[PDB]
Amino acid sequence: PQITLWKRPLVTIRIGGQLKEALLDTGADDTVIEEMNLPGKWKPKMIGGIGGFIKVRQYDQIPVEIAGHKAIGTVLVGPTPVNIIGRNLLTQIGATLNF
Amino acid sequence: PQITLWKRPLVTIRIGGQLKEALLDTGADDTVIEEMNLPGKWKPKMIGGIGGFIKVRQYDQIPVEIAGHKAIGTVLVGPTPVNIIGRNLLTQIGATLNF
């Protein structure tokens, strides 16, 4: 689909068999999801954003369905203000910026 | 044009008569520019993200050229690690997400 930016590019995603809302974020290198229970092992990690660094749980090869499109990759779980889908997963679904 | 997301979507912009490299960010509601002595009246503001909040100066009606595309709107100047072009200006240049 073609998405305009007059409103936040929020879409429904399915992760861990659970539906959630997430922001298509071209300005994010990684995908960061709000604290939740994901199966499998995780390694501690730190990522930075506008107001500093935060500690997150890194889960690898996690299946994520974005607007019906399949992706399998790294998902960081931590105290983020909103769920964001970053470039690591956006590239998997062939997302591009056009103008 | 069409921009892929293999790398950070960095483009050249022109603000206050200066050329800068900025990030096209669909996840940013506002445009945040690195510290610079821009002329004009401003109002104190606090914006948050991953990381917490940072203090910025809000400047309205600032002419910004993005890849040859003229635009004008609110620009927040503060201690940001990178120049961020948010949705407030992306909509003006007709930018869209496609997948």
Ligand SMILES: CC(C)(C)NC(=O)[C@@H]1CCCCN1C[C@@H](O)[C@@H]1Cc2ccc(cc2)OCCCC(=O)N[C@@H](CC(N)=O)C(=O)N1
């Ligand atoms: C207006 C304002 C910029 C404050 N909004 C945001 O930061 C909102 C808040 C809610 C969640 C999404 N973010 C936008 C998101 O694109 C932000 C904006 C941004 C901040 C700092 C950056 C680069 C981009 O420097 C490199 C810092 C490394 C980086 O890419 N950080 C990403 C997250 C990540 N590690 O994948 C990020 O926070 N991206």
